[PDB]
Amino acid sequence: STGSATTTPIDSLDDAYITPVQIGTPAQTLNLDFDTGSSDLWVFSSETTASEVDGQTIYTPSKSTTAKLLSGATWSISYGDGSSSSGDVYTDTVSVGGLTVTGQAVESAKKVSSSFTEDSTIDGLLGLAFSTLNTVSPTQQKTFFDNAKASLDSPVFTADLGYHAPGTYNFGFIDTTAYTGSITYTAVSTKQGFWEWTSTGYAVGSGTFKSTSIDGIADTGTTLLYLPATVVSAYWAQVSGAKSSSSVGGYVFPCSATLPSFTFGVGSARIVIPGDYIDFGPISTGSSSCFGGIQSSAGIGINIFGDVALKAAFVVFNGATTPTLGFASK
Numbered sequence: 247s248t249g250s251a252t253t254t255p256i257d258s259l260d261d262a263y264i265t266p267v268q269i270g271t272p273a274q275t276l277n278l279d280f281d282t283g284s285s286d287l288w289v290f291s292s293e294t295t296a297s298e299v300d301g302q303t304i305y306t307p308s309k310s311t312t313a314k315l316l317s318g319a320t321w322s323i324s325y326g327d328g329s330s331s332s333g334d335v336y337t338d339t340v341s342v343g344g345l346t347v348t349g350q351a352v353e354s355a356k357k358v359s360s361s362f363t364e365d366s367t368i369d370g371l372l373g374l375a376f377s378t379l380n381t382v383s384p385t386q387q388k389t390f391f392d393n394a395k396a397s398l399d400s401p402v403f404t405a406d407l408g409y410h411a412p413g414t415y416n417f418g419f420i421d422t423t424a425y426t427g428s429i430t431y432t433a434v435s436t437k438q439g440f441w442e443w444t445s446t447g448y449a450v451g452s453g454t455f456k457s458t459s460i461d462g463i464a465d466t467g468t469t470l471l472y473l474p475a476t477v478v479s480a481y482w483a484q485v486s487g488a489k490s491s492s493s494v495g496g497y498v499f500p501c502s503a504t505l506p507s508f509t510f511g512v513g514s515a516r517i518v519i520p521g522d523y524i525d526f527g528p529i530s531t532g533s534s535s536c537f538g539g540i541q542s543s544a545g546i547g548i549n550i551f552g553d554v555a556l557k558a559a560f561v562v563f564n565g566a567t568t569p570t571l572g573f574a575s576k
Contacts (some may be wrong), residue, residue: 249345
């Protein structure tokens with residue numbers, strides 16, 4: 247089997263991407279944030295504290311003939327950005343782009359933090375990291391990909407995120423028309439539950455490539471590219487007037503700037519992020535200070551190849567017995 251679904255930016259800045267997901271019988275379609283940095287499929291629901299729902303579409307398990315309460319199961323997750331959610335658990339039929347999993351754990355939110363409430367366009371998350379990170383207790387649950395894997399034509403999914411445009415998540419096949427050149431594969435460590443890999447270095451604009459190992463995670467659920475402070479300083483030093491602002495919470499730059507590209511290495515291959523991908527617009531409405539898309543990971547404890555990096559590539563998440571990651575230009 248295979249599946250293929252379009253993923254769409256939630257706003258003009260590509261702050262996140264949403265993908266329609268069918269849950270239950272008859273189908274209830276929710277728009278979920280596919281997140282290769284976490285492993286819970288959770289949704290706004292009829293159980294979510296009323297004051298914490300503001301425009302989201304909700305899952306109502308009582309209206310699904312295939313929904314079953316997973317007795318005694320609860321979940322609670324806290325994300326790196328400080329947001330969180332928690333609740334109870336159902337199993338139900340879940341379909342993504344024509345690919346169907348029966349008995350998928352659907353984590354129904356009873357509580358969500360303010361950032362989720364305030365984002366009317368995101369109805370929940372669909373985690374695509376390794377199932378070892380799943381927060382369901384007392385019986386840990388599998389991700390949608392984990393459940394689907396055996397049935398897939400090939401045990402892979404791909405992320406093809408667009409810049410200011412829709413893109414695609416495919417399951418079970420590699421669309422050879424979706425990228426240019428070849429796919430370069432690189433080793434993955436699953437030790438922390440992430441798609442963790444090691445970039446071979448970077449370049450800023452037309453500058454020389456610096457060969458250096460940068461360990462980080464491929465994370466579709468994080469907006470920006472978070473890299474070591476040395477690397478980030480080297481990038482922003484090429485932008486007149488750019489500075490790190492403690493009050494704003496990162497590097498900012500004059501909105502009048504033309505940003506240089508940023509290149510990262512995948513083995514001997516190179517992925518080029520155009521400068522425009524690194525512009526996240528005014529820090530507040532009407533400001534001439536703009537927020538940078540490359541930020542320091544100092545304090546996070548890990549480097550994160552988020553959407554800013556991933557959208558410059560066609561990315562293969564290879565879930566074979568020994569997982570690997572593939573990157574191609576596009």
